């Protein structure tokens, strides 16, 4: 992680109003099986 300061402006205030207690990120794969590039 680089060391520095970066402002984070608000983008979208979505009024969902539901219960959330877990999450899971998504990933996109490339087909040549499957090969994925370097990411973090």
């Amino acid at each position: 992680l680089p060391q520095g300061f970066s402002a984070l402006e608000p983008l979208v205030d979505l009024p969902i109003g539901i219960n959330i207690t877990r999450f899971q990120t998504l990933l996109a794969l490339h087909r040549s099986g499957w090969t994925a590039g370097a990411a973090a």
Binding site: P15, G17, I18, N19
Partner: protein
């Protein structure tokens, strides 16, 4: 500002309800008694917030 749409049976004891009512298991959903021949308590009211 949260809507609950879960149909799971409420469990009070240690016996699993297995999706149906029974011992220490009751249906959370109850129906209204809206009738025109009754009093204010059974009179439906359209509430907008």
């Amino acid at each position: 500002f949260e809507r609950d749409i879960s149909t799971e049976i409420y469990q009070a004891g240690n016996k699993p309800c297995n999706g149906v009512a029974g011992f220490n298991c009751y249906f959370p959903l109850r129906s209204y008694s809206f009738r025109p021949t009754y009093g204010v308590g059974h009179q439906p009211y359209r509430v907008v917030v």
